[PDB]
Design a protein around this motif. Structure first.
Motif, PDB file in Angstrom:
ATOM      1  N   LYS A   8      51.521  43.628  45.226  1.00  0.00           N
ATOM      2  CA  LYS A   8      50.444  44.514  45.654  1.00  0.00           C
ATOM      3  C   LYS A   8      49.103  43.805  45.765  1.00  0.00           C
ATOM      4  O   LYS A   8      48.200  44.322  46.431  1.00  0.00           O
ATOM      5  CB  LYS A   8      50.318  45.697  44.695  1.00  0.00           C
ATOM      6  CG  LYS A   8      51.340  46.796  44.925  1.00  0.00           C
ATOM      7  CD  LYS A   8      50.794  48.156  44.516  1.00  0.00           C
ATOM      8  CE  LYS A   8      49.414  48.403  45.108  1.00  0.00           C
ATOM      9  NZ  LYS A   8      49.133  49.854  45.265  1.00  0.00           N
ATOM     10  N   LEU A  30      48.523  41.251  47.481  1.00  0.00           N
ATOM     11  CA  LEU A  30      48.392  40.664  48.809  1.00  0.00           C
ATOM     12  C   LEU A  30      47.583  41.528  49.767  1.00  0.00           C
ATOM     13  O   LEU A  30      47.246  41.059  50.858  1.00  0.00           O
ATOM     14  CB  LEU A  30      49.776  40.401  49.400  1.00  0.00           C
ATOM     15  CG  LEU A  30      50.482  39.142  48.906  1.00  0.00           C
ATOM     16  CD1 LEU A  30      51.819  38.985  49.591  1.00  0.00           C
ATOM     17  CD2 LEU A  30      49.614  37.921  49.148  1.00  0.00           C
ATOM     18  N   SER A  31      47.268  42.767  49.396  1.00  0.00           N
ATOM     19  CA  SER A  31      46.499  43.668  50.240  1.00  0.00           C
ATOM     20  C   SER A  31      45.010  43.644  49.919  1.00  0.00           C
ATOM     21  O   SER A  31      44.282  44.550  50.336  1.00  0.00           O
ATOM     22  CB  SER A  31      47.038  45.093  50.118  1.00  0.00           C
ATOM     23  OG  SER A  31      46.750  45.637  48.843  1.00  0.00           O
ATOM     24  N   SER A  79      42.541  41.723  54.887  1.00  0.00           N
ATOM     25  CA  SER A  79      43.605  41.184  54.054  1.00  0.00           C
ATOM     26  C   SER A  79      44.784  40.678  54.871  1.00  0.00           C
ATOM     27  O   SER A  79      45.685  40.050  54.308  1.00  0.00           O
ATOM     28  CB  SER A  79      44.087  42.242  53.060  1.00  0.00           C
ATOM     29  OG  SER A  79      44.781  43.284  53.722  1.00  0.00           O
ATOM     30  N   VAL A 137      53.485  47.568  51.711  1.00  0.00           N
ATOM     31  CA  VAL A 137      52.584  47.696  50.573  1.00  0.00           C
ATOM     32  C   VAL A 137      51.787  46.409  50.368  1.00  0.00           C
ATOM     33  O   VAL A 137      50.710  46.436  49.761  1.00  0.00           O
ATOM     34  CB  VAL A 137      53.384  48.102  49.316  1.00  0.00           C
ATOM     35  CG1 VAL A 137      54.238  46.949  48.802  1.00  0.00           C
ATOM     36  CG2 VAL A 137      52.465  48.650  48.224  1.00  0.00           C
ATOM     37  N   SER A 138      52.277  45.285  50.891  1.00  0.00           N
ATOM     38  CA  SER A 138      51.577  44.009  50.844  1.00  0.00           C
ATOM     39  C   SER A 138      50.873  43.689  52.157  1.00  0.00           C
ATOM     40  O   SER A 138      50.492  42.534  52.377  1.00  0.00           O
ATOM     41  CB  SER A 138      52.550  42.889  50.478  1.00  0.00           C
ATOM     42  OG  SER A 138      53.657  42.871  51.362  1.00  0.00           O
ATOM     43  N   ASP A 139      50.705  44.694  53.026  1.00  0.00           N
ATOM     44  CA  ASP A 139      50.081  44.556  54.348  1.00  0.00           C
ATOM     45  C   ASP A 139      50.795  43.515  55.209  1.00  0.00           C
ATOM     46  O   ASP A 139      50.165  42.678  55.858  1.00  0.00           O
ATOM     47  CB  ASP A 139      48.586  44.245  54.237  1.00  0.00           C
ATOM     48  CG  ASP A 139      47.765  45.464  53.875  1.00  0.00           C
ATOM     49  OD1 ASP A 139      48.362  46.539  53.661  1.00  0.00           O
ATOM     50  OD2 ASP A 139      46.523  45.350  53.804  1.00  0.00           O
TER      51      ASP A 139
END
Ligand SMILES: *[C@@H]1O[C@H](CO)[C@@H](O[C@@H]2O[C@H](CO)[C@@H](O)[C@H](O)[C@H]2NC(C)=O)[C@H](O)[C@H]1NC(C)=O
Ligand SMILES: *[C@@H]1O[C@H](CO)[C@@H](O)[C@H](O)[C@H]1NC(C)=O
Ligand SMILES: *[C@@H]1O[C@H](CO)[C@@H](O)[C@H](O)[C@H]1NC(C)=O
Ligand SMILES: *[C@@H]1O[C@H](CO)[C@@H](O)[C@H](O)[C@H]1NC(C)=O
Ligand SMILES: *[C@@H]1O[C@H](CO)[C@@H](O)[C@H](O)[C@H]1NC(C)=O
Ligand SMILES: *[C@@H]1O[C@H](CO)[C@@H](O)[C@H](O)[C@H]1NC(C)=O
Ligand SMILES: *[C@@H]1O[C@H](CO)[C@@H](O)[C@H](O)[C@H]1NC(C)=O
Ligand SMILES: *[C@@H]1O[C@H](CO)[C@@H](O)[C@H](O)[C@H]1NC(C)=O
Ligand SMILES: *[C@@H]1O[C@H](CO)[C@@H](O)[C@H](O)[C@H]1NC(C)=O
Ligand SMILES: *[C@@H]1O[C@H](CO)[C@@H](O)[C@H](O)[C@H]1NC(C)=O
Ligand SMILES: *[C@@H]1O[C@H](CO)[C@@H](O)[C@H](O)[C@H]1NC(C)=O
Lengths: 426, 184, 185
Positions: free
Chosen positions: A250, A252-253, A261, B51-53
């Motif tokens: 999570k 990474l956003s 991002s 969720v991690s783009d």
């Protein structure tokens, strides 16, 4: 005390945690070659991170080997599980069941949920899904993988079964040298002598002791089946590892002060010179996240290694022998212990001697007879009101005070609280 | 994440699927593998996220179909070596894949022929930790030399070659339990 | 040595600056433009130093745990005899000798390993004249015709006398009792 209770208690110890590996180029940069070229200018950050994670992953298997592989003689499980009335059937594997584990081990393996099921995920499960994106798929897509342990659960169960079979057939002898066979009643008599009770107490109450042992094993079964949160420590280890991996995914956003991002938006919206600043910001943030994860994993690995060292010490000193250390292997006087395989850990079933039903007696430090002071060899002088006897400390077995039970030191004028009585002479 | 109204004068290119390619959809660039998608997406929106783009799906501007984006070599690959100054042969472990899916997972058609040697062969078998290629499965049991994982170890020789075996827990032993005999 | 060499080799990284050399940045740019690149290099090198110190602290904790175990073994095996199983070698511990090593200690554990076992027919107790006799220190063994008493870890057969055994009760409750004679001096 005039009676006793055979108590079996459980101790749950973590041994290993999940082995994780990280690809830096997939996590920080994904598939873009511009970020890979810019990450090449940051030196040996990721060699250090991979070295630390590889050391942790090797240490996990080292912990499992140090706990469960102490003896390299795989003793066969006996065909008859009853040893002098002691049932032993629920801690040994059942030949009529397809599982190679015991009943207690089968109960323990169903108690840990193991929500972080990486392996269940293979190639083709993360692709072609009808939406419903999984966290494990996001872990795999960003270079975070979970390596399987070297020893499977079946081999750990085989080690546990070999340990229990060796304890049942040879007792304490196979932990030192070759396995010397002994009847189980005589082994329990030796353990009773170890805790300080004469073996006649074990032999005259063998049926009652075996019944108490079987009832305590059954109570362990009911406590594992009904009462939840018994395997709290292993569940906490699993939850901590899974939540750390989910936090790493999570993170990474986060923009880390950049315009986005997403690396592809920065690359496709800006030229090279303007994009290097934002890509460097993202690289610094993601490297910080990876370094933080590796540091927390190293600290948790140190804690798990300490727990596994304690578990290996308990396996050496309580399964392969009888411990005189107080409260090291259960409350009460330790008789014997049985390991049980658990998810990422070991469960020790500690059989202890708990004296009960105490009775008041009038006692004296010594007996003055014919001007000589007699002191008890092993036990205390007790009086039931009219007559003086000598009995062992942990069990009331009154005996006639003779010259063989006592020894003479001096005269009965220096000892405080001496009592005049007669000492029998055969 | 809306349909494009104003675009640049860029010329389009025919779709290439099941290959590791660079792509450019509506100005959203990237690198990955394009595959046909069963995903259903709400209208007037183009690309799917994570969720991690991470852009995992994208709607095609011309054929109006969603396509998956899979990163190139997302699976784990481990290489087993007896070592330099001992040999040059290696064994490759493709973690958590089946042996029949190895050329599809690693994109063996885009690799060098030296890498395409290890994509398939007679020395392949599932080891519960993935597919191991380059080591033959022997039926003997030895002590562990190179830990593959899930009970499998590897060693050089046993013409020297890399073999894979189930690790041995120890020497098999039996104690003849009797209720009236002791060993002194 | 590897940690120190990695810390040295980390100085050749740009960390997002135009160069990894401070002198090139200072000599090629004026003050305001150089502060950005020097700050980037300072942040990267401070991160490298912090990483090295963190790994060194974790390794120091592990080394301290090992040294505490070594001191415990020195106290309990060199200065005494340990009854703890497998604490100071396989077998029954007799004595230990320390040896100095580079950055460590080597313990020479002298242990007792019994060997050459022999099968014997054994009984929990001996019923003699209606009384149950239990061994004090050892077990009752039979060579086929005669019953003896010997220590557990070494076969030294002795004549079953009233000094070797003790009497508890009658020979009707003990499971597996064997009728024999108990010598009386
Ligand atoms: C050891 O305990 C187990 C569990 O209580 C006993 O096994 C059960 O025995 C009952 C009575 O015969 C049967 O109805 C069950 O089907 C058995 N269950 C299993 C899982 O085997 C066992 O009999 C006990 N052993 C001895 C020798 O008394
Ligand atoms: C000890 O307790 C058990 C279990 O309650 C009982 O059956 C037994 O009779 C007791 N023994 C004595 C000597 O009181
Ligand atoms: C022993 O005596 C004390 C003092 O009178 C009393 O409180 C206690 O209950 C007695 N214990 C037993 C086991 O009867
Ligand atoms: C004490 O024990 C003796 C020997 O068994 C017995 O004769 C006597 O009656 C007992 N006294 C009491 C008060 O119970
Ligand atoms: C024990 O204590 C009592 C008071 O409780 C005292 O009278 C008596 O002298 C003491 N006896 C000894 C032997 O110390
Ligand atoms: C052009 O776009 C339309 C949708 O606006 C689509 O149906 C069509 O396939 C595209 N291509 C051509 C060659 O007409
Ligand atoms: C891959 O192998 C597993 C068993 O290891 C099996 O369940 C699965 O169906 C296989 N997948 C394919 C696509 O053949
Ligand atoms: C190993 O044994 C199995 C049967 O257990 C057999 O099918 C297989 O061919 C054997 N493999 C080799 C290499 O001999
Ligand atoms: C003791 O007897 C068992 C069972 O007959 C046998 O397997 C074993 O070899 C014997 N041990 C010795 C030391 O002779
Ligand atoms: C057992 O030992 C006794 C005493 O030494 C001896 O007389 C006898 O012959 C022995 N029996 C056997 C079967 O060796
Ligand atoms: C010992 O076991 C045998 C069967 O192996 C049985 O016949 C015998 O009665 C048992 N003896 C005792 C004392 O339990």
């Amino acid at each position: 005390p005039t009676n006793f209770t055979i108590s079996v208690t459980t101790e749950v110890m973590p041994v290993s945690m999940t082995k994780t590996s990280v690809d830096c180029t997939m996590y920080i940069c994904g598939d873009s070659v511009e970020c890979s070229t810019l990450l090449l200018q940051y030196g040996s950050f990721c060699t250090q991170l991979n070295r630390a994670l590889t050391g942790i992953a090797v240490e996990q298997d080292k912990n499992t080997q140090e706990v469960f592989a102490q003896v390299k003689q795989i003793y066969k499980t006996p065909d008859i599980k009853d040893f002098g009335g002691f049932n032993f059937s629920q801690i040994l594997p059942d030949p009529s069941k397809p599982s190679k584990r015991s009943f207690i081990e089968d109960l323990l393996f169903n108690k840990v949920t193991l929500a972080d099921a990486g392996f269940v995920k293979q190639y083709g499960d993360c692709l072609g899904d009808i939406q419903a994106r999984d966290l494990i798929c996001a872990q795999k897509f960003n270079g975070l993988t979970v390596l399987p342990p070297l020893l499977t659960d079946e081999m750990i169960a085989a080690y546990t079964a070999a340990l229990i079979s060796g304890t049942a057939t040879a007792g304490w002898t196979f932990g030192a040298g070759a396995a010397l066979q002994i009847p189980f009643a005589m082994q329990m008599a030796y353990r009773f002598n170890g805790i300080g009770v004469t073996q006649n107490v074990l032999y005259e109450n063998q049926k009652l002791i075996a019944n108490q042992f079987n009832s305590a094993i059954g109570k362990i079964q009911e406590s594992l089946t009904s009462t939840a949160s018994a395997l709290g420590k292993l569940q906490d280890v699993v939850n901590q590892n899974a939540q750390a991996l989910n936090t790493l995914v999570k993170q990474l956003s986060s923009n880390f002060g950049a315009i986005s991002s997403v690396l592809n938006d920065i690359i496709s919206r800006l030229d090279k010179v303007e994009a290097e600043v934002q890509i460097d910001r993202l690289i610094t943030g993601r490297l910080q996240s990876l370094q933080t994860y590796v540091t927390q994993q190293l600290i948790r690995a140190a804690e798990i290694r300490a727990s596994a060292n304690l578990a290996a010490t308990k396996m050496s000193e309580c399964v392969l022998g009888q411990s005189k250390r107080v409260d090291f292997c259960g409350k009460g006087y330790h008789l014997m212990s049985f390991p049980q395989a658990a998810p990422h850990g070991v469960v020790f079933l500690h059989v202890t001697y708990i004296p009960s039903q105490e009775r008041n007696f009038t006692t004296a430090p010594a007996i003055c007879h014919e001007g000589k002071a007699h002191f008890p060899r092993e036990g205390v002088f007790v009086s039931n009101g009219t007559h003086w006897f000598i009995t062992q400390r942990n069990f009331y077995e009154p005996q006639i005070i003779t010259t063989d039970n006592t020894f003479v030191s001096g005269t009965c004028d220096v000892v405080i609280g001496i009592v005049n009585n007669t000492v029998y002479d055969p | 994440n809306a349909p494009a109204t104003v675009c640049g004068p860029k010329q389009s290119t025919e779709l290439i699927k099941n290959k590791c390619v660079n792509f450019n959809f509506n100005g959203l660039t990237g690198t990955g593998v394009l595959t046909d998608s069963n995903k259903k997406f709400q209208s007037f929106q183009q690309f799917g996220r994570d969720v991690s783009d991470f852009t995992d799906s994208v709607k095609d501007p011309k054929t109006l179909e969603v396509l998956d984006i899979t990163p190139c070599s997302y699976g784990g690959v481990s290489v087993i070596t007896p070592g330099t100054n001992a040999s040059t042969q290696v064994a490759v472990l493709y973690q958590d894949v089946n042996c029949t899916d190895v050329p599809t997972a690693i994109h063996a058609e885009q690799l060098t022929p030296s890498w395409r040697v290890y994509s398939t062969g007679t020395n392949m078998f599932q080891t519960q930790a993935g597919c191991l290629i380059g080591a033959e499965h022997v039926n003997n049991s030895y002590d562990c030399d190179i830990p593959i994982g899930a009970g499998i170890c590897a060693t050089y020789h046993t013409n020297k070659r890399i073999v894979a075996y189930v690790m041995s827990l120890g020497a098999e032993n039996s104690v003849a339990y009797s209720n009236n005999t002791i060993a002194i």
